[PDB]
Design a protein around this nucleic acid. Sequence first.
DNA 1: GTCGCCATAAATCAC
DNA 2: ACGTGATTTATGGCG
Lengths: 66, 58
Amino acid sequence: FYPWMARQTYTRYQTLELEKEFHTNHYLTRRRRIEMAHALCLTERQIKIWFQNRRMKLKKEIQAIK
Amino acid sequence: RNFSKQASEILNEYFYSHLSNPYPSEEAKEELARKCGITVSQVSNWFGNKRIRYKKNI
DNA sequence: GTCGCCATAAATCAC
DNA sequence: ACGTGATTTATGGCG
């Protein structure tokens, strides 16, 4: 009717490693983006997108307090 | 956990009356949150869930 | 020509 | 078990 009317889950291991890096540094360096991608079999975009989603999740965590 | 009969009635009345563009603005989401007795995030979740489930159920 | 935030889609989770 | 409200992957628009 209207124009508006017209994904892979990560393993518990991939999420564990991605979380570990975020807990160390909330921001990803160019070198870490390539190191994480190779070790976890995810693309460089996937690691970047994850960090952006995790920062956005952290935003909603701090705001949830008040 | 599940929204009251009235809250869901309010959300559905909005959705179907705005079927051309069911994307309420920040203030419209706030007005809906105050009326339903829920949060703005809950309104955003509800609309997101409603838009996908409506288009699939066609 | 780079990046990150935000709202959102769609799939999936889970109380 | 189910269903609905919440969360997880992924996109594009915009500053």
